Amino acid sequence: DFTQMFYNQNVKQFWLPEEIALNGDLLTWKYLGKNEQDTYMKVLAGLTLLDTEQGNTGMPIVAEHVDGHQRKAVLNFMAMMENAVHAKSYSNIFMTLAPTETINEVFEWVKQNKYLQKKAQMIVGLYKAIQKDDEISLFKAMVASVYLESFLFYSGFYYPLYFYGQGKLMQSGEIINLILRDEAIHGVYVGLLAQEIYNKQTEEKKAELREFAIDLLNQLYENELEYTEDLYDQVGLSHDVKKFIRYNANKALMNLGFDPYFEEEDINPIVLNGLKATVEPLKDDDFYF
Amino acid sequence: DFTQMFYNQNVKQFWLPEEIALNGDLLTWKYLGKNEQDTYMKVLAGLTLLDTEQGNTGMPIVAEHVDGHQRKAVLNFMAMMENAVHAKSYSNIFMTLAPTETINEVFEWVKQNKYLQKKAQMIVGLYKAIQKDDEISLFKAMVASVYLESFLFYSGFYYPLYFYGQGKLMQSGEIINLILRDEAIHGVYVGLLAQEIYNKQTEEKKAELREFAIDLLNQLYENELEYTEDLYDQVGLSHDVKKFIRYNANKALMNLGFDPYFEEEDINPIVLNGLKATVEPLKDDDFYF
Amino acid sequence: VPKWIQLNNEIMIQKDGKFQFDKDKEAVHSYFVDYINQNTVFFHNLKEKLDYLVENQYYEEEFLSLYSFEDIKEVFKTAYAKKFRFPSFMSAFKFYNDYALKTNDKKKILERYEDRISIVALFFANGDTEKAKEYVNLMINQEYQPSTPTFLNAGRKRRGELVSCFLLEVNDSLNDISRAIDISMQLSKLGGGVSLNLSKLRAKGEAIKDVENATKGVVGVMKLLDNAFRYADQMGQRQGSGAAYLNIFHRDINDFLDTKKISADEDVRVKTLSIGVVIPDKFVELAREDKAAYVFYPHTIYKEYGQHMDEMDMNEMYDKFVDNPRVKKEKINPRKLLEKLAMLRSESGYPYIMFQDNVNKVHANNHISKVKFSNLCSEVLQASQVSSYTDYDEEDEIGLDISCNLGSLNILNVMEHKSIEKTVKLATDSLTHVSETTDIRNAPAVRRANKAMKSIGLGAMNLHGYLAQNGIAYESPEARDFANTFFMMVNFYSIQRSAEIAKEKGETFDQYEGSTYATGEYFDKYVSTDFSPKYEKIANLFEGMHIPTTEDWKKLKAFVAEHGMYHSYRLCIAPTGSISYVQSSTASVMPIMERIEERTYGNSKTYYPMPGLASNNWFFYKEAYDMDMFKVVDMIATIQQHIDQGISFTLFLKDTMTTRDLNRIDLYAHHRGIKTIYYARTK
Amino acid sequence: VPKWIQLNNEIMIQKDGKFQFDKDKEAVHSYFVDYINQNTVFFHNLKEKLDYLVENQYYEEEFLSLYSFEDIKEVFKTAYAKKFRFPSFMSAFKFYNDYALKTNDKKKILERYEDRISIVALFFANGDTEKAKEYVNLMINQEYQPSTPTFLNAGRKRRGELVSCFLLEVNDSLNDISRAIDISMQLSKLGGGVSLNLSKLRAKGEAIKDVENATKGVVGVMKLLDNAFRYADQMGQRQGSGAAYLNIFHRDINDFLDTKKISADEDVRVKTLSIGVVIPDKFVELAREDKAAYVFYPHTIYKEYGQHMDEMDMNEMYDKFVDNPRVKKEKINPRKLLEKLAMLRSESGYPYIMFQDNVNKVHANNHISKVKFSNLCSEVLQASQVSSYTDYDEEDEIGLDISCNLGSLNILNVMEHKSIEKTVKLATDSLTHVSETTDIRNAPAVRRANKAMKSIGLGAMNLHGYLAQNGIAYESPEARDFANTFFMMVNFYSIQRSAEIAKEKGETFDQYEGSTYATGEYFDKYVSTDFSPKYEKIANLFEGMHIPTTEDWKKLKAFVAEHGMYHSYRLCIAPTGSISYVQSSTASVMPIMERIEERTYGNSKTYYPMPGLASNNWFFYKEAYDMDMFKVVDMIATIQQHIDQGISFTLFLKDTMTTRDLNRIDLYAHHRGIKTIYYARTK
Ligand SMILES: Cc1cn([C@H]2C[C@H](O)[C@@H](COP(=O)(O)OP(=O)(O)OP(=O)(O)O)O2)c(=O)[nH]c1=O
Ligand SMILES: Nc1nc2c(ncn2[C@H]2C[C@H](O)[C@@H](COP(=O)(O)OP(=O)(O)O)O2)c(=O)[nH]1
Ligand SMILES: Nc1nc2c(ncn2[C@H]2C[C@H](O)[C@@H](COP(=O)(O)OP(=O)(O)O)O2)c(=O)[nH]1
Ligand SMILES: [Mg+2]
Ligand SMILES: [Mg+2]
Ligand SMILES: [Mn+2]
Ligand SMILES: [Mn+2]
Ligand SMILES: [Mn+2]
Ligand SMILES: [Mn+2]
């Protein structure tokens, strides 16, 4: 009942980072403190890693196991967006704002950062555990994918949105909003596929799947807290970002058909402001008048 | 040396089925004989069936085994074009020209056809034989992929190009020309990835891979001749189609860095109508001797 | 924002449900009193002005020296006595931006409308004070408008030529191709548009001195000409404009048409070169019967018969060419070629279509030559003879290359003044003077044909404006009745003036005695058929103005037979692009495209309502896209029967109509006697 | 796979650790016995063959009628008396694929090597049987090779011109530019490469008769010429090749160079037009001191001084141009321009570098004109005068456009026969005959300069082959000693033959009296310096041959003063591309690129070892890329001091060489007196 409308929405949302000129951010970037620039680079690098794996691994593997040519076409399109559009856009931003050495250093930093490695290990592990014709392993990977789309990106998205909302780094911010617009529909779509599998189960099996989903969310959440503190303490925003990730965790649960898990909190209003002619053959009668 | 350049060329060639209005083809379709309509339907179904294998297996399997983030992104983009763009385009052409019952029957016929099946299963067999961390099996699959993209499609493309060059079925011919333009670049790109593997091999292993490629080409070519007579004798075109197959076989070989196998031949004119070393400054004392 | 363009934009602000058309009068008044009078250089007396203009290389001393300054003063008084006022902002803006003389730094304004008109009139009269006053009255009343080259350059020192349309015949030789490139660059340097016939050139794959498959065809010459026109672009302000014409029976016709396809490669596509296709009645007959047509290799025909293919009658030699084994031919589908023509015109507006047998069945000078191609504007239809440019040491055989001076009657102002006869005769005299004073010293055939043929083109404009301001629909039979009577009268008085000029000067145009004027066959339909208006509404439009009858045409025929004709060709209806704004007239005899025309000049947006547009005649100003092209074809064919040359006929197509509709319009135009089709404009 | 192709492929099969060089004799023997003797049309007698060739439009009856058939039979006897054998398969293959006369369907072979040589000799002698026999002995011994045009076309009815290098001056006018395009197409039609001097054309953004910033510059003319050469593609046989030369002080020099960048826009890039840059000593002096230089607008200089910028000495006029406020210029960095030149040569091999003051400091005809540019192969360096092509009605002012006739001595065969004097004099006679018999009807300046200057080009080839077969390294001082002595002797005997021809005909070349030959300034270094070999090994190479001394040069100087000099120019070392295979010789005076040449013809690959390559002389055949380009510059400068025109000097570079290394090579060539640099070939 939904794939065709998602197909149409995904293809109509198609974009490339080159559509957005980035040289306009040069001055507002220059004006940020060293702490702010550091957090910003690292935040986008963490996002780049997530999209790299979502494009290389997550979306293609889910596409492989989901039945139906139209469902596969949507998932293939989403996969392309992840690595050919989203992951690449971050390099466009980096290449504009930062010198090569700072770019090299931040990519080295992703490799050695323990929270980023842990979250990649956990998510990709679940993708690679999918067994052919085994719907339960597929469900588990789809939960992981929804958590990546609708929860994990948001510790990263906070900062570009926070600046956009203050009228700073607005070209980079425009790119990020386009990425976010895509991930929102990706999270909903994968959520609907996960619910399909969940709804086939016995009540006992469903109870176990909810346990899996909640245990996984809590494990990812605890890691994300440490990641958030590590990045945002130097810019004074860790508590604010934490509220934002809890907000989005609830959206991820809802995408999976589950009740919200965290209590509602006031999000920084700045971040909320951050959001041919037809050819017809000649007849014989055409030559007489 | 080449992936970013191909990335650029691929994304700038992006298109959607909806861009070409198909209904005006009915004004020339109605004037074709039964044999012409039959051949066109059968050719179209042949292309559709082969392209589906490439979208569901060929491109995604190669993307899975190739190392490199940028290569995986380009390959993902190509897989997207197969599944999201090409497949919808073929379906659109069919739905415009034939009623539902006729489409189902043509696909039943072509699905049972000996020559279409022989080539489809030969290609799919090589994709299924790729082994993790074995570059030889990957190379063999890449050869199969290049043969599909740059050679096997062309016994089929001939007919729409033949009409397109005569002013008939111009809307569907425009679509086919866009598809063909994508397959050409797909073949060239996968060809470069195959040459990379080939160049890492010993001289004895190279000679062995050359023998594999020529042997495979021979098997496919002999089946193409039979496929060609089966479809095109009823419309009197087989001689010229055979010249077009050999010409495209030579292009496929050149994509794989191999010499042409067949002598140069001229192609049907109607179908043709359808178709830095290192900068160093002078630091003085270079003007004195 | 300028005050005048702010006032001009108040036209679109609908007050009480109506456009504020009166704002354009306020717009032009503000334009003058805030820009023009401020930027106008004013001298103490006209003597100081003329001395300043002559001394500083603005004017020519030779033509001003034929009048005593009292006569020049009288002429300028006659111009200023009318107290002409531009009715719209666009008229004055276009004049003072395109035709008004400006200082060498393009800073101030030296010429007003009256000054330019007086200078053009003194140039036309050539020493005659009374004739200069007559020309001043003619142009200040806006009854006659000299073409953009003449009106812009008459009496100016650093000027281009007064003729901007040239037609060149290219012979099948490398010497002739090189000379064609040279002459094209020379004429484009002068500012003129150059049309070239490429039919005599042998096709691709023909032999060059017994080595076969050596000729690159007409497309290589097309690329040469395209780069020659790109080079000679006159600063690039108006880039070099060229046209190439090919007979539809040329073997290279498909490659000739493929140069305009959107998917054409950079090694084939031509950008600055318009293309026209000459279609004999044989091709239309072959397509009608759905038979198999043949395109021919011109060099084989020339070798076999000793004549070029386009110099022969295809309706009588096509079967001989097909049956001849020594003639090389290629099989084509004529209906497929017609569909390709329609598709190319839909996608690009090209090629121009010339119906060769429609031109030549009424052509008056077939003894000199048949018309084989048209000009860049697709309305000049004259006999041409190809030149034979030989090696450097040898003498060249100079032929006849076409060129005519353009001039338009304003139908509205001519009809208001009841002065068809006087306007036509004075315009004929002015065009004759422009022909006589033109001397192209780098195009030998153009010069020879200008001296020999003495061809002029007298067109008309404001046909739709006059009809809409008189409550007549363009498609209505009454409009065609008016056009019939008006253009028959124009033809009558142009023939009378040509005969009077021949009698006075004692000379006719070269090879006049073989023309249909000399034999009297030209006047058959005029001495047999009466062209008086058939409707009482139209007959009142001509009240107070004598309409020549059959007896008058018999007397004129006797007069022509006894005195001859000075001009081989007299009437051609050009597009009249930018002078239509200055004259406050609709462009040519074609219907209007937009009722209110919106344009952007620099960073300013301004709107131009059609001349005389109001609420009482809003629906009589029907846009060209909303009307039936069959009725427009009927109107143009009614006008064409009184025009010796062609009419620049633009086809106005909607997006909904297919290529079949365009082909039907083309075939109906061919059936109705349309000589040329200019453009396929799509909205 | 053909048997001869298999045998030729066995050279690379290494037997006993060595290449099987003897397989090429088997390869050529098999090639002949299996293909040539089968496909050679045989006639019962020579009379029947000659009659068949003249009557079937293969030969010219005019030159053959100059002899009785007995004389022609004896000439053919002399050709076949040598029993000439092609030493390698590639020699015979190249001759019988490029120069041997074939049937009109290119199926059989009419001419053997002896027949072609006999016909060329009979054409050279022009009625003299003993002279024809002398030419037969000279060519069958392969001491002298006429150029590809002369050798291929002499005595053929359907032949191109015997000259293939032309140099045209283009004047700053549309008439002259159109004439240049016409003449370029006419000469490319004849099959000749055309070089155009674009330095007189005014730069981009110059005024055209009071309209400022209207000129497209030299790049618009470059596009016109590129399309002209693409169209005139030699009847679709061989791609039309042309060259454009611009002075480095021309304002458009950067635009001129940007036409060869790989990233060049399609509206700027030229494909078939080679480019050469002319560099005066002033530019090198400015770059040496890193002073910022000025490029000048040529039309401002012409208006200020009445002379073209390239007609004046930049060494004295540069400061005056810079200090003149009425001369327009822009600052450039000469070192950056040099680096751009080196980068362009690394990327594409362009432009050619012509050191203007190196050419003109030893130019013998500076009174006629300075040498302003070179040909397409960068070895023709002659005085030229620009033509003033006026309007069609007016009379043109014809100047001098360069065109010289090419011939090559085989250094190995001339040295082994001890016949420097006889070969040089006979080659001079043959080149003189080719010059007299050349008449070009569409290039008036080329024809006038051919009639007046009577300039010829006598080159040399097989220098590296002769040295390596004699155990002398190309970079060795002994090689330069041999080149010095050999080319001094060649110059001596060419001057002697030219003076003898002047004495016989009683006429010198036009404006000879102002030349350095007339004043004796040419002979100063020859009457003051001894050019005998300084090495005993080299002096032994000239045993049995009189090396001209200082007294001999004084006698020659007196003889030239008494009798004059027939040829303005005599010696130019052309690349000698395809005739080197037929002669079994290394190309020109350049060192060999590869020891064994791997080429593919059709679907079969062929191997060509350098002539005389073996195990004993393997390392004397050092590849050009492995060589020190400074020593190659030294060799060419040693040769250049005895050549009145230039030498085609190709730079052979490694991939590791930087832009600085190429610039250093160019600056050392300039320092050593190198006149032109042809190509930058990178491995
Ligand atoms: C020289 C040349 C001619 N042509 C074409 C253009 C001309 O229309 C046509 C005639 O060339 P010509 O200049 O007339 O050549 P020709 O006189 O030697 O040959 P012929 O005896 O047949 O007349 O050949 C080319 O296409 N490319 C060329 O390079
Ligand atoms: N004074 C003047 N008159 C001009 C100029 N341009 C055109 N004219 C026209 C206006 C008159 O019709 C005519 C005579 O003007 P004038 O020389 O001032 O004469 P007058 O007003 O003393 O009779 O010339 C101009 O610049 N100055
Ligand atoms: N017979 C013959 N001789 C040829 C041909 N092409 C070149 N020649 C040369 C070979 C001889 O040197 C010369 C004379 O040949 P001939 O006419 O057979 O002479 P002869 O030996 O009978 O007196 O011509 C050729 O085709 N046939
Ligand atoms: Mg000719
Ligand atoms: Mg000039
Ligand atoms: Mn993403
Ligand atoms: Mn996503
Ligand atoms: Mn596909
Ligand atoms: Mn594909």
DSSP state string for A45-93: HHHHHHHHHIIIIIHHHHHHHS-SHHHHHHHHHHHHIIIIIIHHHHHHH
Asked if D380 and D478 sit in the same domain, the reply is: yes
- Which one of the ligands is nearest to A78 CA? 7
CA distance C46 to C49: 5
Residue among C251, C331, C659 with most chain B CBs within 10 A, to mutate: C659
| Four-CA torsion D466, D472, D475, D480, nearest 10 degrees | -70
Q: Omega before C351 cis (within 30°)?
A: yes
Domain boundary among C115, C142, C169: C142
The verdict on whether residue D576 carries a ligand-binding annotation is yes
Query: How many other β-carbons are positioned within 10 Å of the β-carbon of residue D492?
Result: 22
Looking at D93, D116, D142, which one is the last position of a domain? D142
Catalytically annotated residue among C153, C171, C197, C375: C375
Full 3-state SS string of D150-193: HHHHCCECCCCCCCCEEEEECCCCHHHHHHHHHHHHHHHHCCCE
Residue in this structure with the two tokens 């009374």, named with its chain if needed: C130
C-alpha distances (whole Å) from B87 to each of A80, B45, B76, B171, D432 are 16, 11, 16, 16, 74
Rounded-to-integer distance, Cα C494 and Cα C572, Å: 12
The structure tokens listed for C534 are 């058939």
Residue A259: strand, helix, or coil: coil
One domain, residues C301 and C176: no
Residue C454's identity, in one-letter code, is K
Touching, C vs A (3+ Cβ pairs under 8 A): yes
Count of Cβ atoms closer than 10 Å to residue D42 Cβ:
9
Asked if residue D383 lies in contact with residue D369, where contact means CB atoms within 8 angstroms, the answer is yes
CB contact at 8 A, C403 and C195: no
| Number of other CB atoms surrounding residue C26 within 10 Å | 17
Q: Where chain C is broken, by preceding residue (C–N > 2.5 Å)? A: none
For a pocket test of ligand 3, which of D58, D71, D76, D101 has the largest count of ligand atoms closer than 8 A to its C-beta?
A: D76
Contact C485, C532 (CB under 8 A): yes
Please, which residues bridge with residue D607 across strands? D598
| C508 and C411 co-located in one domain | yes
Question: From CA C222, how far away is CA D221, in angstroms rounded?
Answer: 17
In a shared domain, residues C506 and C378: yes
Residues C224 and C310 in one domain: no
C-alpha angle C472-C473-C476 in degrees, rounded to nearest 5: 100
> Any residues with CB less than 8 A from the CB of B200 and at least 6 apart, and which?
B135
Q: Is C114 a catalytic residue?
A: no
Same domain, D322 and D292: yes
Q: Which atom of ligand 1 is nearest to the CA of C220?
A: 26
Could you say which of D333, D354, D377 is where a domain stops? D333
Q: Would you give the distance in Å from CA D162 to the centre of its chain?
A: 14
Tokens at D451, concatenated: 């009639």
| Residue C445 structure tokens | 């055939």
Q: Do B170 and A84 touch (CB under 8 A)?
A: no
Active-site residues of A: which are they? 90
Task: Enter the tokens of residue B41.
Answer: 């339907």
- Longest CA–CA span in chain A (Å) reads 86
Q: Give CA–CA dist B190/B187, Å, rounded.
A: 5
- C408 has which bridge partners? C145, C459
Using an 8 Å CB-CB cutoff, list chain A residues near B74: 84
Q: Do C407 and C298 reside in the same domain of the chain? A: no
DSSP letter assigned to residue D243:
E
Task: Domain count for chain C, please give it.
Answer: 3
Gap between the Cα atoms of D138 and D161, Å rounded = 23
SS (H, E, C) C130-199: HHHHHHHHHHHCCCEEECHHHHHHCCECCCCCCCCEEEEECCCCHHHHHHHHHHHHHHHHCCCEEEEECC
What dihedral do alpha carbons A224, A225, A228, A232 form, nearest 10°?
180
Does B51 appear as a known binding residue?
yes
* Contacts with D580 (C-beta within 8 Å, 6 or more apart), sequence order: D461, D462, D586, D587, D588
Domains of chain A with bracketed CATH: 1-275 (1.10.620.20)
Q: What distance in Å separates the CA atoms of residue D309 and residue D19, rounded to the nearest whole number?
A: 58
SS3 D144: strand
Two tokens at B43? 């050719």
Q: Which of D235, D155, D252, D236 is nearest to D200 (CA)?
A: D252
| DSSP assignment letter at A288 | -
User: CA C499, CA C563: separation in Å to the nearest integer?
Assistant: 6
**Tokens linked to C12:** 């679109």
Closest CA to C353 of C367, C338, C364, C368: C338
Task: Output the six-digit token pair for B171.
Answer: 């809307």
Expressed as residue numbers, the domain containing C155 is 143-280+334-683
Residues D560 and D426 in one domain: yes
Query: Locate tokens 């067999």: which residue?
Result: B125
Q: Indicate if D261 and D322 belong to the same structural domain.
A: no
The SS3 of residue D244 is strand
Question: What was the resolution (in A) of this experimentally determined structure?
Answer: 3.8
Complete DSSP assignment for D38-62:
HHB---SSHHHHHHHHHHTTSB-HH
Q: Do C231 and D209 touch (CB under 8 A)?
A: no
Backbone gaps in chain D, preceding residues (C–N over 2.5 A):
none
CATH of the domain at C241: 3.20.70.20
What is the distance in A from the centroid of ligand 4 to the CA of C176?
9
Distances (CA, A) of C47 to B244, C52, C72, C76, C362: 81, 8, 9, 11, 51
D162 Cβ contact list (under 8 Å, min separation 6):
D149, D150, D153, D154, D405, D434, D437, D438
Q: What share of chain C is helix, strand, coil (3-state, %, to 5)?
A: 45, 15, 40
Identify whether residues D270 and D287 lie together within a single domain: no
Q: Is D572 a catalytic residue?
A: no
CB within 6 Å of ligand 2 — which residues? Answer: C 42-43, 45-46, 49, 73, 76-77, 80, 115
CA-based nearest residue to C503, from C448, C554, C544, C558 = C558
**Distance (Å, rounded) from C-alpha B86 to C-alpha B188?**
18
A 10 A CB-CB count for C32 gives: 19
Residue A69, annotated as binding a ligand:
no
Strands D676-677 and D604-609: unpaired
Q: Which atom of ligand 2 is nearest to the CA of C77?
A: 12
The span from the CA of D57 to the CA of D498, in Å, is 35
| Contact assignment for B167 to C658 by CB distance below 8 Å | no
- Judge whether C164 and C149 are in contact, CB under 8 Å: yes
The DSSP symbol for C210 reads S
Token duo for residue D65: 């009628």
Partner-chain residue, chosen from D655, D656, D664, that has the shortest CB–CB distance to B286: D664
Cα D173 to Cα D388: distance, rounded to the nearest angstrom: 9
Closest-CA residue to C541 (of C472, C633, C635, C642): C472
Cis peptide before D477 (omega within 30 of 0): no
Shared domain for C239 and C302, answered yes or no, is: no
Q: Which helix (H) or strand (E) holds C278?
A: strand C273-279
Q: Are residues D325 and D349 in the same domain?
A: no
Looking at chain C, which residue has its C-alpha nearest residue A282? C660
Tokens 């007294």 correspond to: D551
